[PDB]
Amino acid sequence: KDKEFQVLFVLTILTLISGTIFYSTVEGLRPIDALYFSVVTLTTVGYGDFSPQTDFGKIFTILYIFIGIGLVFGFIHKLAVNVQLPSILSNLVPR
Amino acid sequence: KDKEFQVLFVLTILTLISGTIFYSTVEGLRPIDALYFSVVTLTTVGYGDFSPQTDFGKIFTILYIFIGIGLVFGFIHKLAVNVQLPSILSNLVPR
Amino acid sequence: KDKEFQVLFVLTILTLISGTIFYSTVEGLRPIDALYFSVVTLTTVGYGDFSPQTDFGKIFTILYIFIGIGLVFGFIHKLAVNVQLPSILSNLVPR
Amino acid sequence: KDKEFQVLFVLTILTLISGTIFYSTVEGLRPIDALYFSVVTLTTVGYGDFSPQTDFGKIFTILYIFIGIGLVFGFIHKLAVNVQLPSILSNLVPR
Ligand SMILES: [K+]
Ligand SMILES: [K+]
Ligand SMILES: [K+]
Ligand SMILES: [K+]
Ligand SMILES: [K+]
Ligand SMILES: [K+]
């Protein structure tokens, strides 16, 4: 299950890297703003402080959302159940 | 399962076409902006760079969200489990 | 299952009515804008074209989200599986 | 199950407290606006009336979303099934 989580973890990083590179280059965002934008899109928070202005950027975002949500959400759930939950349970039993 | 995914795939396309046509016509968006708006609403990202200004558009959006989320989300999950997952597993075994 | 869906359906209506009344009165929105705002909050689209300006409105929105998401999402899923799905299947068999 | 819900309930409070403190201090929001922002981020509504302006705040928000969504969503579901549902069923049987 550490190997389940590692694969998902890695795939998320690669996914957020892909959005960082595209949005920084095509839409002109600072690298840190691209990442933060990529994270805020794929978790569907969507503040809208950043949003794509070019048509290429709009098209890309369509496909990035559809390809990216299922992964991101899969990692978060794996993180909650296989990492966050056990550490919670462990804190309720003094060793 | 390719036939499960095809039906959902098709139904999503038709759903996004429906929003493209309405928002372009009633709210005046360029076709590409309507589509991008439709995609950003039904995945609940909701940047808000576009949002309906007319009462008809507001009413329509209410019903489009309720009818449209269950489908969109169903396709994304089908896409993740029946397409994205297998291709991931296949990349871990040289043929 | 029509009785499952009816109860949820009703509970959603009552929930959106509650938000319509509060936001129209406390935040001053037109009734139609309150409803549209209530729908856009509880489905977590969150365009932000409307958002509460008063502290009372901010507090209320906190609790409305937590009480309201589980219901709304429950209705949408019931709608997708017990209404939308069957009608889809029925359209693939000429009577 | 009251003990399931209590643990989750508590963990959510602590999570929203953590965001209240950071956003009030680092981003300068009034305590009430930080809380409301924290709640609106972790439920992925994301109105965007508030959004982090500093790079530290942007980085923090990335990790807060990933750590925080799984919890928040877990509480809401526990709330819907173990508290909201039973009280609904109880209202359909006069004692
Ligand atoms: K959302
Ligand atoms: K959102
Ligand atoms: K949003
Ligand atoms: K927004
Ligand atoms: K979900
Ligand atoms: K969601």
Side-chain angles (χ1 to χ4, degrees), chain A residues 2-95, chain B residues 2-95, chain C residues 2-95, chain D residues 2-95:
Chain A
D2 314 352
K3 305 276 161 264
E4 194 144 358
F5 186 96
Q6 276 154 55
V7 158
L8 279 80
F9 194 178
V10 172
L11 280 175
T12 296
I13 296 288
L14 296 179
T15 305
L16 299 177
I17 296 178
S18 285
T20 303
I21 294 176
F22 175 91
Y23 286 123
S24 185
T25 58
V26 167
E27 288 286 337
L29 301 177
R30 281 189 314 150
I32 181 65
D33 287 338
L35 178 62
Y36 158 74
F37 173 69
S38 290
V39 169
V40 167
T41 288
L42 295 185
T43 51
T44 74
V45 179
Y47 299 116
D49 49 356
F50 296 91
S51 64
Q53 298 187 295
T54 73
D55 283 7
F56 256 155
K58 273 159 189 158
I59 297 169
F60 176 89
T61 302
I62 293 172
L63 273 50
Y64 189 57
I65 289 179
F66 276 109
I67 295 163
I69 280 176
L71 190 184
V72 160
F73 278 13
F75 169 77
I76 297 204
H77 150 276
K78 241 52 70 10
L79 172 71
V81 303
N82 299 340
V83 182
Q84 284 178 295
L85 177 70
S87 70
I88 292 169
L89 300 172
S90 64
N91 216 27
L92 291 169
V93 290
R95 289 181 178 185
Chain B
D2 314 352
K3 305 276 161 264
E4 194 144 358
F5 186 96
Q6 276 154 55
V7 158
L8 279 80
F9 194 178
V10 172
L11 280 175
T12 296
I13 296 288
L14 296 179
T15 305
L16 299 177
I17 296 178
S18 285
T20 303
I21 294 176
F22 175 91
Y23 286 123
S24 185
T25 58
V26 167
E27 288 286 337
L29 301 177
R30 281 189 314 150
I32 181 65
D33 287 338
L35 178 62
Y36 158 74
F37 173 69
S38 290
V39 169
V40 167
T41 288
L42 295 185
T43 51
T44 74
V45 179
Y47 299 116
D49 49 356
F50 296 91
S51 64
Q53 298 187 295
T54 73
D55 283 7
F56 256 155
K58 273 159 189 158
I59 297 169
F60 176 89
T61 302
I62 293 172
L63 273 50
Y64 189 57
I65 289 179
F66 276 109
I67 295 163
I69 280 176
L71 190 184
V72 160
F73 278 13
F75 169 77
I76 297 204
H77 150 276
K78 241 52 70 10
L79 172 71
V81 303
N82 299 340
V83 182
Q84 284 178 295
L85 177 70
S87 70
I88 292 169
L89 300 172
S90 64
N91 216 27
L92 291 169
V93 290
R95 289 181 178 185
Chain C
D2 314 352
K3 305 276 161 264
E4 194 144 358
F5 186 96
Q6 276 154 55
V7 158
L8 279 80
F9 194 178
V10 172
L11 280 175
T12 296
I13 296 288
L14 296 179
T15 305
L16 299 177
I17 296 178
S18 285
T20 303
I21 294 176
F22 175 91
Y23 286 123
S24 185
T25 58
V26 167
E27 288 286 337
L29 301 177
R30 281 189 314 150
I32 181 65
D33 287 338
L35 178 62
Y36 158 74
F37 173 69
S38 290
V39 169
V40 167
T41 288
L42 295 185
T43 51
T44 74
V45 179
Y47 299 116
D49 49 356
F50 296 91
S51 64
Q53 298 187 295
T54 73
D55 283 7
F56 256 155
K58 273 159 189 158
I59 297 169
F60 176 89
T61 302
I62 293 172
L63 273 50
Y64 189 57
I65 289 179
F66 276 109
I67 295 163
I69 280 176
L71 190 184
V72 160
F73 278 13
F75 169 77
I76 297 204
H77 150 276
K78 241 52 70 10
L79 172 71
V81 303
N82 299 340
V83 182
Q84 284 178 295
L85 177 70
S87 70
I88 292 169
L89 300 172
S90 64
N91 216 27
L92 291 169
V93 290
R95 289 181 178 185
Chain D
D2 314 352
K3 305 276 161 264
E4 194 144 358
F5 186 96
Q6 276 154 55
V7 158
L8 279 80
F9 194 178
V10 172
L11 280 175
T12 296
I13 296 288
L14 296 179
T15 305
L16 299 177
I17 296 178
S18 285
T20 303
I21 294 176
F22 175 91
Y23 286 123
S24 185
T25 58
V26 167
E27 288 286 337
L29 301 177
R30 281 189 314 150
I32 181 65
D33 287 338
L35 178 62
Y36 158 74
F37 173 69
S38 290
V39 169
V40 167
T41 288
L42 295 185
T43 51
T44 74
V45 179
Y47 299 116
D49 49 356
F50 296 91
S51 64
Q53 298 187 295
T54 73
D55 283 7
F56 256 155
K58 273 159 189 158
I59 297 169
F60 176 89
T61 302
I62 293 172
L63 273 50
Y64 189 57
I65 289 179
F66 276 109
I67 295 163
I69 280 176
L71 190 184
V72 160
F73 278 13
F75 169 77
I76 297 204
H77 150 276
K78 241 52 70 10
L79 172 71
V81 303
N82 299 340
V83 182
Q84 284 178 295
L85 177 70
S87 70
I88 292 169
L89 300 172
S90 64
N91 216 27
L92 291 169
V93 290
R95 289 181 178 185

